[PDB]
């Protein structure tokens, strides 16, 4: 069955990194469809604006909780506070990333580590905190990832490590869930260049290729999440999105799906 | 890569670090390297097992053989280990990154400690060891060998934390190889993708759960070294040597080639 | 955009070639049970009468046979004209016959190569050409039976494999021609592994069931699928797909 | 790795050598100092003389139509006599073709199959004793259309696909029977040949590679005893043509 805006009507959603970029755009779509949303990011000032607009858009309710996802206590506590405020949770959209520039890896281990903590580890912590509420609603988890979390790109090594780790972690637990019969879907989003302020300021110097619109991106993420799709692909090039599928991975996974015996 | 056949003489007098070399694949690499007449420095936590590896290496024919014991959970050890290892041999030609944190098969529930420890031991420390070794490797136009798994190319249930860390290795080191191509760094990076190998540890952890043909650790070890010496980008090793034909990704090579002009 | 149910063949007008034995005979039986009109062909006149009588028994709307050799292109063309006359049209053309073949090393057997190409490939084109007006009348379907050896190289089946490869290239090309020209005739290529037919079991390895093979060919044809895969091993069937070929056709489409 | 030394003094046949890629192959072989025999249906005399100007060890022609299988078998015996043996058989000729939707042109399908495929098998059968003696090479020229479906070239595509099925199957027969003759299938994208440019202008919107390098890459591949040789304008494309799932399935080499 196709996508219909009424799927999100009165759904309780969390969106992280929702103060700008694709995250903000997702908050607004959900707002228009009349969902309950809790947005988060570090900056209370920009979050206050996302919230007022979400209200003007017709969100069933909108609120923010500010803090840094470098802090795993905040991450864990935020999900509880969000869930209690809404009276449950049907969808968790994991979107935030730590600030990153294009540069050749030098000696910047602290940045590799910060990338792994914010972009990967916090997502695991947020998922654990949310799973009980999601099991209750038979809800879904949306993980926002990149082309560089599927293939190798220079200039983004710390950031690619962390997005590859997302695919590794979440694709493994999706298999775990389907045998444990946990009715929580996990959707991985693989995005090419998207025209967000920070992306444009980060890349527009070095490389360049055509950036897709953030507003359509955001909407395509929500729909893959709504339709319990395993992977969402989104780029300006149709070539790229055809090429990003990995049929041989799919083959190996079925091949090996028999050679274990679990209960 | 080098357009030529592997010959053991390629490693004679070469200066090599092997991590997690107290047992399993790591120990067999040290032995192979010793038989070939390389200088070897091995590491792991177990002082006592490391001493035994060193003794066999010396009588096997190593130009020289030493060990330094410590935990790769400690990023200060990792960084110092490499400095100390390069002092022992007078430089470094190959760095083989092989160790991993003790892990066993389990459904993920809420062990964030374990996910964290995995990322630190199986991923972060490899970055730290690589930063420390790069100067020495540049002086010798040498090689980095990163040992990985099937579960670092495809999803596999029960190894979620481990798989996260091995995927991250592909992502990090594959990106650095691109960067080494742009900036003209003559240090090869070989990522090894292994199926089930019959190591003590693996055999106990998967017994009764997975039902697969385990391949021989001795041959596995040699293929890794050969891969490294021939400066291959990837090495594939599995008992079912046809499976290794799937795991290569031409769409990925194409997108990497395609975006190479942006 | 659907799933299969036997009732899709009820009242359909279906030609089955190579229907005197093996898979083709099973296909005719399946179609009879589904209540189709069936015109069967093969060389064996006396065997075909027996196939026809049992098809009636089973519930075919009607059943007829016409005997002849598909080495004769004039027979191929006349057969289709007469099959259409007996049925009042045509909904599905199942092209299944092959010439007699053994596993053998290739030395100097040009005559076997040519004959393979004639019977296994060229007769399929002639029958298609003759059937096309009617299949256009009906928005019908062409079902081409092929082989693993028509996708990949196998020693000892060189002439057979040349003819099965040729089928893929010929019917896959016109299939794209029918898209662009908006001809609503589907083309199904069935790629099959070892099947437990009397002929194959002697000539030759895990053999899949012929009865179940026959139904799967019909299903793909009925659902208007581009390719159908059938082997005793699920592993083999996963691998027969070629995503890369799909990309390149997707590519060159512009 | 390849060096022009490799072909100095080698006895080579080039078919369809009176125009385009074929002609260029003779020239390269001439600048390499090879014995060439070239064939086609006059212009061969022009080609044979220019081969001498470029310093071929010898340069001869035999004119005929590869529609005639008697000619084909005779031409090779003749050519083998003239050079006293054969090292490389380069099969390059094709029948004249146009871009066109297939409708009811069975004669063209038949002609294509005879000239483009059956003749290549006739030439190989006649060449096999000599190529065995000299541990030689067979080089088959094929196309994108011989690996993927492509509208407008159905007949051609069938014949090219048939070359792949046939020659890759015997390649594997040669290995298991330890016959030390190599087989090189060349898969070419669009080349800026005089027939191809006239045939596809205004219809295929594609970048054409040059005649010169194509011939050389063809020659190198066969000199180097490579299984397949891809050549197209697109650096892009050529990573997708390789089919690992085919490789894997063939590894029911058992
Ligand atoms: N844009 C692209 O070209 C593109 C391409 C591929 C993938 N993606 C993916 O899409 C997602 C969104 O990217 P985007 O370009 O929209 O991002 P963006 O505009 O930079 O927004 C990032 C959001 O995350 C927040 N954030 C930064 N540090 C944080 C921290 N320590 N704790 C909590 N939140 C933090 C930011 O707000 P604060 O600073 O106030 O905390 C901001 O709200 C990312 O996951 C990215 O990987 C984007
Ligand atoms: N065996 C397989 O089936 C298989 C399959 C796919 C990939 N691989 C890869 O191949 C490589 C070797 O695996 P294996 O099976 O040989 O493993 P193993 O036998 O368990 O060896 C692991 C090594 O790492 C050391 N180690 C553990 N914790 C450490 C720490 N904190 N700091 C430093 N060293 C530590 C161990 O010694 P101590 O405890 O004494 O420190 C031992 O020397 C790994 O990278 C693995 O991911 C193996
Ligand atoms: N069996 C397998 O393992 C297998 C595997 C892969 C693909 N396939 C494909 O499946 C199809 C059926 O194979 P099968 O195993 O069922 O073969 P089969 O039992 O030998 O039947 C072949 C049919 O073709 C007919 N035939 C033979 N020569 C003919 C001619 N010159 N003119 C007209 N009809 C002729 C035969 O009947 P008459 O003698 O009465 O004329 C018979 O009815 C074939 O297209 C084959 O390539 C089969
Ligand atoms: N050019 C491309 O864009 C392209 C693309 C894909 C594949 N290819 C392959 O490259 C090879 C050569 O192509 P090309 O473009 O060079 O073709 P071409 O320029 O037209 O040359 C074809 C040759 O075949 C000869 N020929 C034609 N009919 C013949 C017959 N009945 N008997 C014997 N010889 C005959 C012609 O000489 P006469 O007319 O004097 O007899 C001519 O010498 C072919 O196998 C083709 O499939 C080419
Ligand atoms: C958020 C963004 N992510 C990207 N993800 C990707 O795969 C890149 C390379 C692009 F989208 F292809 F451009 S950019 C990014 C990551 C790292 C540095 C800058 C930057 F804009
Ligand atoms: C070291 C081993 N690595 C593996 N990597 C893999 O891909 C596994 C699943 C196997 F090889 F496919 F079996 S096992 C392993 C990882 C995690 C737990 C046990 C264990 F033995
Ligand atoms: C009809 C059959 N076709 C086959 N096609 C195939 O791909 C073969 C090799 C098999 F199915 F893989 F076994 S068998 C066949 C072809 C040639 C000789 C015998 C014979 F049984
Ligand atoms: C010789 C050429 N062969 C080709 N082979 C191919 O695969 C084509 C479609 C091209 F190479 F893709 F352009 S063209 C050709 C074949 C048939 C008709 C015209 C014509 F130019």
UniProtKB/Swiss-Prot annotation, chain B:
UniProt GO molecular function: 11-beta-hydroxysteroid dehydrogenase (NADP+) activity; 7-beta-hydroxysteroid dehydrogenase (NADP+) activity; cortisol dehydrogenase (NAD+) activity; NADP binding; protein homodimerization activity; steroid binding
Positions of substrate binding: 149
Activity modulation: Hexose-6-phosphate dehydrogenase (H6PD) provides cosubstrate NADPH, and the glucose-6-phosphate transporter in the ER-membrane supplies the substrate for H6PDH, their activities stimulate the reduction of cortisone and abolish the oxidation of cortisol.
Annotated positions binding NADP(+): 20-46, 71-72, 98-100, 162-166, 197-201
Sites where a glycan is attached: 102, 141, 186
One Gene Ontology biological process: steroid catabolic process
Lumenal side: 4-262
Enzyme Commission number(s): 1.1.1.146, 1.1.1.201
Location relative to the cell: Endoplasmic reticulum membrane
Gene3D superfamilies the UniProt entry points to: NAD(P)-binding Rossmann-like Domain (3.40.50.720)
Catalytic residues of the enzyme: 162 (proton acceptor)
Catalytic activity from the UniProt record: an 11beta-hydroxysteroid + NADP(+) = an 11-oxosteroid + NADPH + H(+); cortisone + NADPH + H(+) = cortisol + NADP(+); corticosterone + NADP(+) = 11-dehydrocorticosterone + NADPH + H(+); a 7beta-hydroxysteroid + NADP(+) = a 7-oxosteroid + NADPH + H(+)
Bilayer topology annotation: Single-pass type II membrane protein
Post-translational modification comment from the UniProt entry: Glycosylated.
Disease annotated for this entry: Cortisone reductase deficiency 2: An autosomal dominant error of cortisone metabolism characterized by a failure to regenerate cortisol from cortisone, resulting in increased cortisol clearance, activation of the hypothalamic- pituitary axis and ACTH-mediated adrenal androgen excess. Clinical features include hyperandrogenism resulting in hirsutism, oligo- amenorrhea, and infertility in females and premature pseudopuberty in males.
Function: Controls the reversible conversion of biologically active glucocorticoids such as cortisone to cortisol, and 11-dehydrocorticosterone to corticosterone in the presence of NADP(H). Participates in the corticosteroid receptor-mediated anti-inflammatory response, as well as metabolic and homeostatic processes. Plays a role in the secretion of aqueous humor in the eye, maintaining a normotensive, intraocular environment. Bidirectional in vitro, predominantly functions as a reductase in vivo, thereby increasing the concentration of active glucocorticoids.
Family stated for the protein in its record: Belongs to the short-chain dehydrogenases/reductases (SDR) family.
Name the record gives this protein: 11-beta-hydroxysteroid dehydrogenase 1
Organism of this sequence: Homo sapiens
UniProtKB/Swiss-Prot annotation, chain C:
Regulation: Hexose-6-phosphate dehydrogenase (H6PD) provides cosubstrate NADPH, and the glucose-6-phosphate transporter in the ER-membrane supplies the substrate for H6PDH, their activities stimulate the reduction of cortisone and abolish the oxidation of cortisol.
Catalytic activity, reaction form: an 11beta-hydroxysteroid + NADP(+) = an 11-oxosteroid + NADPH + H(+); cortisone + NADPH + H(+) = cortisol + NADP(+); corticosterone + NADP(+) = 11-dehydrocorticosterone + NADPH + H(+); a 7beta-hydroxysteroid + NADP(+) = a 7-oxosteroid + NADPH + H(+)
The keyword Oxidoreductase appears for this protein: yes
One Gene Ontology biological process: steroid catabolic process
Tissues/organs with expression: Widely expressed, highest expression in liver, lower in testis, ovary, lung, foreskin fibroblasts, and much lower in kidney. Expressed in liver (at protein level). Expressed in the basal cells of the corneal epithelium and in the ciliary nonpigmented epithelium (both at mRNA and at protein level).
Subcellular location(s) per record: Endoplasmic reticulum membrane
Pfam family membership, one: adh_short
EC number: 1.1.1.146, 1.1.1.201
InterPro entries associated with the record: 11-beta-HSD, NAD(P)-bd_dom_sf, Sc_DH/Rdtase_CS, SDR_fam
Keywords: Disease variant, Endoplasmic reticulum, Glycoprotein, Lipid metabolism, Membrane, NADP, Oxidoreductase, Signal-anchor, Steroid metabolism, Transmembrane, Transmembrane helix
Keyword Nucleotide-binding: no
Active-site residues, Swiss-Prot/TrEMBL: 160 (proton acceptor)
Residues holding substrate: 147
Side of membrane Lumenal, spans: 2-254
Post-translational modification summary for this protein: Glycosylated.
Pathway in which this enzyme or protein is active: Steroid metabolism
Lipid bilayer topology: Single-pass type II membrane protein
Cystine crosslinks: none
PROSITE patterns assigned: ADH_SHORT
Subunit structure: Homodimer.
PANTHER family: 11-BETA-HYDROXYSTEROID DEHYDROGENASE 1, HYDROXYSTEROID (11-BETA) DEHYDROGENASE 1-LIKE B-RELATED
Family: Belongs to the short-chain dehydrogenases/reductases (SDR) family.
Function of the molecule: Controls the reversible conversion of biologically active glucocorticoids such as cortisone to cortisol, and 11-dehydrocorticosterone to corticosterone in the presence of NADP(H). Participates in the corticosteroid receptor-mediated anti-inflammatory response, as well as metabolic and homeostatic processes. Plays a role in the secretion of aqueous humor in the eye, maintaining a normotensive, intraocular environment. Bidirectional in vitro, predominantly functions as a reductase in vivo, thereby increasing the concentration of active glucocorticoids.
The protein, known as: 11-beta-hydroxysteroid dehydrogenase 1
Organism of this sequence: Homo sapiens (Human)
Gene expressing this chain: HSD11B1
């Amino acid at each position: 069955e196709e996508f219909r805006p009424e799927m999100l009507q009165g759904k309780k959603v969390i969106v992280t990194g929702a103060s700008k970029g694709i995250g903000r755009e997702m908050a607004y779509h959900l707002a228009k469809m009349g969902a309950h949303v809790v947005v988060t990011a570090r900056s209370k000032e920009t979050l206050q604006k996302v919230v007022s607009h979400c209200l003007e858009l017709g969100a069933a309710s909108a609120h923010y909780i500010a803090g840094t996802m470098e802090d795993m206590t905040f991450a864990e506590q935020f999900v509880a506070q969000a869930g209690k405020l809404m009276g449950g949770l049907d969808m968790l959209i994991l979107n935030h990333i730590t600030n990153t520039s294009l540069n050749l890896f030098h000696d910047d281990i602290h940045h590799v580590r910060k990338s792994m903590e914010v972009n990967f580890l916090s997502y695991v912590v947020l998922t654990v905190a949310a799973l009980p509420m999601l099991k209750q609603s038979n809800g879904s988890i949306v993980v926002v990832s990149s082309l560089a979390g599927k293939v190798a790109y220079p200039m983004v090594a710390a950031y690619s490590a962390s997005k590859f780790a997302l695919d590794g972690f979440f694709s493994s637990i999706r298999k775990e869930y389907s045998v444990s019969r946990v009715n929580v879907s996990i959707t991985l989003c693989v995005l090419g260049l998207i025209d967000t302020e920070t992306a444009m300021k980060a890349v527009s110097g070095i490389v360049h290729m055509q950036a897709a619109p953030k507003e359509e991106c955001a909407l395509e993420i929500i729909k893959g999440g709504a339709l319990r799709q395993e992977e969402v692909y989104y780029d300006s090039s149709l070539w790229t999105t055809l090429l990003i599928r990995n049929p041989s991975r799919k083959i190996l996974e079925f091949l090996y799906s028999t050679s274990y015996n679990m209960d």
